[PDB]
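Structural prep section.
Before we set up the soaks we want a predicted structure of the protein with zinc ion in place, mainly to decide which crystallisation condition to try first. Input record follows.
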Amino acid sequence: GNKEKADRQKVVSDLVALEGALDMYKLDNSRYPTTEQGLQALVSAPSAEPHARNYPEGGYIRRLPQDPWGSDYQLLSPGQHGQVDIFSLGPDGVPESNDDIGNWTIGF
Amino acid sequence: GNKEKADRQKVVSDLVALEGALDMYKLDNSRYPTTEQGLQALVSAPSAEPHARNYPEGGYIRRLPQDPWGSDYQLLSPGQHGQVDIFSLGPDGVPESNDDIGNWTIGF
Ligand SMILES: [Zn+2]
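Run finished without errors. Recording the tokens verbatim:
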């Protein structure tokens, strides 16, 4: 379907945009925001510990996108087994999840 | 270092932007470009099979970024164990790698 394709593109684009903002937060802070801090950490410095350092004016993203069905995206952090995920719940409660965003390596 | 911090932010930002473009390519084609097709497949329809379907005007990214030290970013796809990575070689040949970008799930 056409609407379905467009919705899928929005979900994937938003989740990767959130991923990038979360990675910029982590470069400044050495860790991602926790689920307790939430994606809100990307727009205002978190009140819950661990506190952010050198928080940039305006935060890390211009706005927090919502999914095509009007649900906020959700953050699992630090997550089970230290795997950080960002997901949409979908229209039907079958989550579309961008998994283990922290899987980066230095060296081969 | 100040330059070093800037370079690191650029590498992470670029690699995530490339990740997003690759994911959009995959939504249209059901698979990522292969290493043989390369990141070039994000800017112009790939000459090598498997050919892209209905390739969009302007491709998937305005232009390919280069890393802070003048090297192209590199794509491993489909990769060892089907794990797709995008990386910078670094100034010193110690790669900074955004790993297993295809790790997404449907359902919990
Ligand atoms: Zn990712």
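Observations: Chain A has one helix and four strands.
Flagged for discussion at group meeting.
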